[PDB]
């Protein structure tokens, strides 16, 4: 029985005003929630402020990316040691926006995963297939490759305490939609793939859905046995909507 | 005359403890400075804390990079609107570490310059030639090309109130250093290049030296007429050393 995790990826959205309002409203909307863990990833300059504002709540912090070095002559980079130092626990790596827009390779993302692991932070490893890969029936091949970049170079124990987020990139448009059954099939495949190396590790990995989640499909999605929560995008910017998703995850896994 | 600017590029160095200690020590060491402007660029997650620690001093804040979007579905990016909101003013763009390790193009860097000007922020445009380029006699061609990415798309007016930092990249990990005379010749070339388009704008541009600057060598660099300060790396992590540099710039440019 895995404790669910709902994480808000704020993407490139935030301000001093917005952080104060949204974190305060999240605390209020999440009052009484005990059965679903909650994390947020504001833009990096606001992590400190958000952590301090989250004091008194159960909201955990996180970040949207990390680089490979801990310190040194690396102007503009993000250090895992510094993310740990300001209080970010859940660090998104390999998001589709970075694999695409920033050409981040599977191997680079696996290096990120390793640095996070060495610092004692929790990677949120994003994986998923494109429109063409999905059409060609390559969903499993792609997800296995993206996972193997870590599994084959770092061992199954690399996944102890880790999170994977499955992004059905192929379903981004309003023309295509992933059903809970389709999502479940991919999550089961992911878990089964790790289980071939270590069944115990596979059992404890948190596999979040990273496709669009709303109040009308959350119950069904979270009703699936291998779906352990969600990495939420736009809905994370509105406290009421985000809390509905968190409560649905709590209700489903109780 | 041009009022000098000494800016500390902390690079990938910082922690809450380090920020508090360093900013406190900088406040003390720089409290008596009048004739040199000072900025610091901590790692992005520490800008807010550093800005709050600097309140009450003349230390200005800055950042080490920016991306192109103000907001939206751009996981992991840095927004100029957010840098403005948290209090950063001097934004380093095109640093040699980013042109090399992150393959940032002249054109990308010029787009970053434009977004910063749209937000009322001050670009610190880094330019400079590699070991191979220096060996090939292309110092001027390279600097001209990197500057032209902005000048030929946004005009000389884009350089109002802006800063340029010249990095002799050929001096990094080669065990060599540019002499003050060599640095001065490059700075005068950069200024003359902009002057071909607008002499007035060229006279007011702050052109910082971005090679290695140390408490020991700051005076000899700041004695040069077209060197208006420095973008300091390692010495920026020790308040005593950084203050010696600031004071050297103040003394060199003082009435
Ligand atoms: Cl110090």
Numbering used by the authors:
A (entry chain B): 1 to 254
B (entry chain A): 1 to 255
Paper text:
We provide crystallographic evidence that acP can bind to substrate and co-factor binding sites and that acP-dependent acetylation of key lysine residues of the central metabolic enzymes triosephosphate isomerase (TpiA) and glyceraldehyde-3-phosphate dehydrogenase (GapA) could alter their function. We used a high-throughput peptide array technology to determine if acP-dependent acetylation of susceptible lysines could occur in a non-enzymatic manner and x-ray crystallography to both confirm acP-dependent lysine acetylation of specific proteins and to examine the molecular environment of susceptible lysines. Taken together, these crystallographic results confirm the hypothesis that acP can acetylate lysine residues in the absence of an acetyltransferase. Finally, we propose that acP-dependent acetylation can be both non-enzymatic and specific, with specificity determined by the local three-dimensional (3D) environment that surrounds the substrate lysine residue, as well as by its solvent accessibility and pKa.
AcP is bound in the active site. Side-chain and main-chain interactions with acP are shown as gray dashed lines. K11 is shown in each structure. An arrow indicates the movement for loop closure between open (cyan) and closed (gray) forms of the protein. The affinity requirement appears to be satisfied by the formation of salt bridges between the negatively charged phosphoryl group of acP and positively charged residues of the protein to be acetylated. An alternative or additional contribution is from hydrogen bonds between the phosphoryl group and hydrogen bond donors such as hydroxyl and/or amide functional groups that surround the lysine. Like K1065 of the RNAP β subunit, other lysines located in active sites of proteins that bind a phosphorylated substrate could be acetylated by acP.
